[PDB]
């Protein structure tokens, strides 16, 4: 709204003068303004991160459980329960921690130096002070501390890639706009943590701190809102369930042993029969919920960040590696990401070649030995280092890149013909131009923008030098020019300026008469793997989206090329988007594709109207712009050149810069949930039938199966290593050809259900007959004999949850070597259950026999025989 007024009514607005504030404003300005600083408020307290685990349902029930443990004198049952949950939250403490964002990177965005007028002394002084209404310089290389409009140009660029993400210097004009422009094109103000490039200007602070547009970027990083794991919400949504489902137990195992004391014959002792309830009540809690379930799926997602470090791609967060597999929306940056950040040409234009394509060759690309030096022989004023990091203006370093590209090298042409000329300061109007001597006779450089250049070139170069042509030369080169402009390239003018002749010095007046040899329009292309990078997305059912900060000139070409918009297609402005409310935002939503010149407040907002729609989104970006989208996103990835701004708020960084790995990385994702879901339906499944068991043990009061200690024993570790070995079933790639998963399908949809209820009643119908045999020989043997034919059933269930609908011959039975290789693991286990040490902890009957075990063993055997033998309920329910 500022940008409008201008001179004296920016002045007048903030009812401070240009000149100098005498310093007794800043003595008051700094006390309601504040300084120009950014400061975190995070209190991140210890208390809040443990009060906040228990609002898990999951938790609490398990608490209760552990302190009646202790009532009753089972201490030992009782701070097993409080160690694993510890677990659970240390677990769930650390994961958000890493994910907390740093104004590291905020730090030193605004160098700590702004010459400042202070009572009318030119001083320089930290950014700190600097507040409203004060005056600052700016000479070249500054970094701009404070966002601001500045009345006074000296021609100067300024870089705004840290704002905007372009790497490219934008001119800025002090002359009034009376328009709404995108934040990018306030040509007539700058802004904290952009780089000067050129020149030297005085701005106007126009507020600091927070309200500066770097520091309202920092309040929209401080909201940290959303990401919520799938995984976790579809958790809670059936944790909720069961969380009810416990506490609808624990109310029939009082009311029955309450209901067996009105009926109970002539003397009953009430406070055995409640005690006696709460032994079951209890067991039946620790027998539901799964204690290793956190530190199991904790374990499997270390898988995925493995699988991905060998592909170049870091993970700093664990469950983001399922987040993968869901994903649907991908949301880019067209520079810095799409591209290298690095320019060059294919199409120059020439009269002789007459080529739209581009040929390399070691000094034979050009007819004649003249024709290709003429092009740019010393226009480039860029150096490349020993290192050879990137150094000067970026339009002019695709030349020498361009001479490199030829396997010409430019240390042997800088050398053989040496600049002479004064060289003319550019300007807004102006061009700078070199002169240089040659063997017998010199030449003026002139390197010109195409829309000014010809204006004041008559003469034309080619075959020779050649009259000026105002007719049939300027059609062709309007039309190349316009073919060029349609295609959305820069294009420069290269002359050779030869009419003067042994000059002292160079004066600006002959700027006429000029020679052209040509003109050539470059473009940043994008990386050589994107093409199959989106190819592949298509194909593998997520939208991928563009949200970039560019012209839309360039972004319409952008996309075209790649395919994922038509060339008729027309993109949305972030002022477009200014003016868009919500309420058609969704309905222009799916539609929307590519966006152009937008702000780091529009990027963020289009992640968060995806996500309204029901989709889990992606966000890759880099620089400091795209970092709001990083964080806000479901998972956001990062490239290794990007600064380490969005590299620190990303939930992935890939170093390598091969894109194509992040498509690799959808793949595993939805493999990586294909286990753990196969996975978590194995170790409920045998939850499921050892509360069959105790709840019919509890109908004929038979005393409580498997004691306290002993049922915690089996979820802690017996069932840990199975759980993994099918947390690493082959992938089964054909399925990753469908549409991504639906955030709101059950954990057991897709049919595993159906599996999980059958194979968790064929559990607890053997580990009852069992108890039978075992009750009818003594009360001491069933406990011990349905514990056996327990913790044997659920270690045999893994050959059947291999697959909900694949049996265990046929399919490879050394097809997996974990999953032999933790079976072979907790029979040894369960061997150490009968030692004579520890028979006694393990309430195991001394009177135990081996063919009383070969009894209930070969119960637990004939249990998974029935689960491979509803083979023929699952063929018959495909025809
Ligand atoms: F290309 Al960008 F933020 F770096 F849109
Ligand atoms: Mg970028």
Redesign the pocket.
Known sequence: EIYRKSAAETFTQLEATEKGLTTSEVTKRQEKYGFNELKNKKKDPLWKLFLETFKDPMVIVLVIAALVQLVLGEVVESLIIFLVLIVNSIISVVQTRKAESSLDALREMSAPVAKVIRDGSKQSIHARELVPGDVVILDAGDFVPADGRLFESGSLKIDEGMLT?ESEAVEKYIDTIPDEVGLGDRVNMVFSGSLVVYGRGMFVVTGTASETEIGKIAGLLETAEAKQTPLQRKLESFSKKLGLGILALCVLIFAVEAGRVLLGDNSADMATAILNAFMFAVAVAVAAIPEALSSIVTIVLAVGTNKMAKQHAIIRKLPAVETLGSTSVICT?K???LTQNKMTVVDYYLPDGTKENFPESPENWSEGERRLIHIAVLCNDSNINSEGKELGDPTEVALIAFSNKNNQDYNEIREKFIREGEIPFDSDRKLMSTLHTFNENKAMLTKGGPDVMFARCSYVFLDGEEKPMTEEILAKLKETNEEFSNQALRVLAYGYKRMPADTTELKLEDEQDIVLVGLTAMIDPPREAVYASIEESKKAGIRTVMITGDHKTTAQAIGRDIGLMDADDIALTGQELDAMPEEELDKKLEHIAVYARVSPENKIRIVKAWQKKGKITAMT???VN?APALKQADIGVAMGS?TDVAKDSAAMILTDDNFVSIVDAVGVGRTVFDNIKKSIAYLFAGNLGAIIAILFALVLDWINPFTALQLLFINLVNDSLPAIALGMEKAEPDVMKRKPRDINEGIFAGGTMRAVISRGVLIGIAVIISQYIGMQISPEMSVAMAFTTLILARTLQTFAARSNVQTAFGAGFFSNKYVIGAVLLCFVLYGITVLPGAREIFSIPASFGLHEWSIAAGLALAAVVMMEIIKVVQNKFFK
Request: net charge negative.
């Open positions: 993400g940056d520079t810095g990401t970006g880099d620089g795209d990007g």
